[PDB]
């Protein structure tokens, strides 16, 4: 049944936080993070939409999706990332 | 049960039908229960079954029931387990001429009438092939006037059929076979009943011929054609383009 949608209401925050952490990555890290992740976060957003069974995207669950991909990239790296622990928490 | 009712209602070709299906059921039952009665092809296994079930209920009829080697065997085995017109002075039966009449798929009532004719007046004869020939021909010409009225290709096919069913190349004798019986059978109330039924009167209707013959010009000799004829002939040239 449910193919719930997403409304372009405040989505340019996507563009914002993406450009933010895509620079913060070079700030202390070796590898990048890339649009692959972004597309995936959108797929997770609609995933949780299907989960809740709501009619379309909710804003305060994109927090969940993006937190997931964030702490995904956290553990995937060196001890050098231990500064990313403090940097990229504001998006929590 | 389908096949049972089939073979049981194959006898015609109140309590009878019921008691006989019950009979065949429990008969077949008894015959197959024990290990005593085997190598009996089901090809044939509902026939002296039916004959003894006729023997049981109340009234039985030897004729028209058995109608062969193992017929006797299985009976005992179960019963213990429990040209044509030059030929002078020929002979015939009920079913011989039922065949020669049923070759046209005519009904059985007409056949029974010819049979009655025979068995009363088969006494003073020279050859019954003539009489029964003429008889069944004047059954055909009277009942088959419709298809012939629209298809004159019939009268050759039919006479050819009975010309070789009785093995002749000459046929005018057959013409006599028709007109002589017509001279003979001309005026009986049953013949009358058939003529009012299927309405030949020489092959022509009553309401026409009486004006044909009383003295009239309104008599409709249909040289002209009917309206529906043209109404349907027009379609043949409608699509004349193709």
């Amino acid at each position: 049944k449910i193919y719930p949608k997403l409304h372009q209401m405040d989505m340019d925050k996507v563009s914002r936080v993406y450009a933010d952490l895509r620079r913060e990555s070079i700030s202390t890290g070796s590898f990048p993070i890339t649009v692959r992740h972004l597309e995936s976060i959108l797929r997770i957003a609609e995933s949780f939409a299907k989960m809740r069974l709501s009619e379309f995207v909710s804003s305060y669950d994109l927090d969940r999706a993006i937190k997931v991909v964030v702490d995904s990239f956290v553990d995937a790296q060196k001890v050098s990332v231990r500064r990313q622990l403090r940097r990229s928490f504001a998006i929590y | 049960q389908h096949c049972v009712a089939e073979v049981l209602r194959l006898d015609p070709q109140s309590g009878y039908l019921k008691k006989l299906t019950n009979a065949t059921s429990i008969l077949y039952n008894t015959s197959l229960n024990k290990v005593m009665l085997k190598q009996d092809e089901e090809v044939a296994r509902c026939h002296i079954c039916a004959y003894i079930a006729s023997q049981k209920m109340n009234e039985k009829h030897m004729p028209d029931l058995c109608y062969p080697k193992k017929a006797k065997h299985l009976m005992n085995l179960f019963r213990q387990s429990l040209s044509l017109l030059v030929k002078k002075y020929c002979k015939m039966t009920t079913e011989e001429i039922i065949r020669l009449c049923n070759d046209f798929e005519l009904p059985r009532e007409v056949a029974y009438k010819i049979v009655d004719e025979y068995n009363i007046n088969a006494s003073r004869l020279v050859c019954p092939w003539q009489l029964v020939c003429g008889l069944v021909l004047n059954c055909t010409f009277i009942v088959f006037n419709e298809r012939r009225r629209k298809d004159p290709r019939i009268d050759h096919f039919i006479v050819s059929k009975m010309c070789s069913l009785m093995l002749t190349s000459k046929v005018d004798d057959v013409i006599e076979c028709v007109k002589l019986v017509k001279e003979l059978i001309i005026g009986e109330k049953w013949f009358r009943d058939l003529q009012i039924r299927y309405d030949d009167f020489d092959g022509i209707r009553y309401d026409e011929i009486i004006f044909r013959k009383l003295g009239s010009m309104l008599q409709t000799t249909n040289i002209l054609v009917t309206d529906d004829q043209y109404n349907i002939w027009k379609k043949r040239i409608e699509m004349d383009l193709a």
């Binding site: 372009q8 340019d12 914002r16 450009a19 590898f31 990048p32 | -």
Partner: protein, 602 residues
Amino acid sequence: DNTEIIKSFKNFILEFRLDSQFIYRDQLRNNILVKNYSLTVNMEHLIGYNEDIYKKLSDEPSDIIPLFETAITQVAKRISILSRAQSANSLPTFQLILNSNANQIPLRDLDSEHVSKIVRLSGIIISTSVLSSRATYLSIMCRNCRHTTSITINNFNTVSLPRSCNCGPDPYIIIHESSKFIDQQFLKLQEIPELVPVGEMPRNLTMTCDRYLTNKVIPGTRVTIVGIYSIYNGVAIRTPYIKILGIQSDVETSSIWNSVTMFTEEEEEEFLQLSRNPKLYEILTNSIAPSIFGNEDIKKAIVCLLMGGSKKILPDGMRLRGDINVLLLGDPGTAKSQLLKFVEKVSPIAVYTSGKGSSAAGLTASVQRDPMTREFYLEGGAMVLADGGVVCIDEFDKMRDEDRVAIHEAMEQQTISIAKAGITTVLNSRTSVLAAANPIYGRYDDLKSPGDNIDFQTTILSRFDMIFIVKDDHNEERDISIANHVINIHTGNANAMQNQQEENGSEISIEKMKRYITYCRLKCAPRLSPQAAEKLSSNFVTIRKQLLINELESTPITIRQLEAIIRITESLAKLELSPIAQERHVDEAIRLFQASTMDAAS
């Protein structure tokens, strides 16, 4: 009776009409000019016209079908003579054909009911066994009486020969040279593997066909069919099979090199409106990747590519590769994978692969032998499937050496050869190539040498006419630009609706351009001007003397990059349907190649 039904049927022939135009009448009139002796039919069209044939053709079809055949032949016989009387002896029965769409029932839900009725269904194909023949009319002579006779058979491609016409039994020889025959085949089927139980292997079924319902199909083609659940021969049992009476194929599933080449006429006029616009190139660049951002220069090569180039032959045989070869090179993101996913869609008859060959996929011709007779047959090839097409690859890095070699030969001559034990092959590839890269740990290669990705430092700057560092160094706003370029895709369809309104304006959708491509790919007759000759000989000697110094400084150049722009310029002019060339696009030529030399420096 039966002739009542025959007339109820034959009125449907010439007395049926819809959309105020005769349908089957003139269909036959055409088919007979085709000398086809068959037709096409829908059975949906018979339900409203008449219900005196449907409910009985359903349950007693074989009782009714040859009647229709004879009715058809009857209509033929009049119209044959009438059309001979119009303008300008042997007229057999016409195979009937039909179809339907009422429903589809699967093999699983069958039973031993509704047997000998007609059923509808789905499935997948395997068999292409052999053209097995049957008879239709065969003459007979007795060996003793010398008593000629004749026999003809009708549908069942019931009785046998005559047992007696003393000659004894079997007195008859079958004459062939005045006998007649027809063909059939034995065709298999099996269900959708996606709609099956978890556990067991699948169940298949055979079928049979006849003259012009033959050879329609080749395996893999998903098809729907309608037929009669017939029978032939544990304790006492007969084999279930089916008789065909209707086949319908997808028009063209997996891309057939024997494709369409004679296009319609209505399309020519808009094609040539698009020939004569000056905006041709810019539209194609605006539309090849509408949901994609930047790298205009990269999208500006594909159109040079898909149109091929100078098929030029000379009286020795040393052809020049009519097409061009390319290599993306760069990092995650940057659309290096998405275009490649796309290009097959826009493509007419080309192919996509991963590396090493894919699952059950020879990256070149992986020859083997026959399940039957143990004989040799050239089987497959991702490089010959796509003969006269492009090929798309990702993960070029992890080749096998044997896998790399023949493909490494194609991109300069496009002809594989295999000469294993008994078979001797020269199989023509004739294909174009799209590559895709895996930079080791990504970006620091510009700080380093050209290479230092993988251990083919040779072929990179050698066998390629389009090589690009494809990246921007995380400009803080390009991110936002591409992000807002792309976020609208997922809902609101504003990126799609913009393409809608721009195709309403000056853009083109997928298939119009597909056909444009196909047409020009096979039509044009390009060439270049002597006047355009020197323009780049000068460029060549200058780039040579230039990087002589800067490469003599202890930091490639080929005759091939010289010979490459020869053909790219012709492609971009080809777009305008250009039997000649001028500097108009030669300027764009080095405008776009310069990216390569800039990369050549670094």
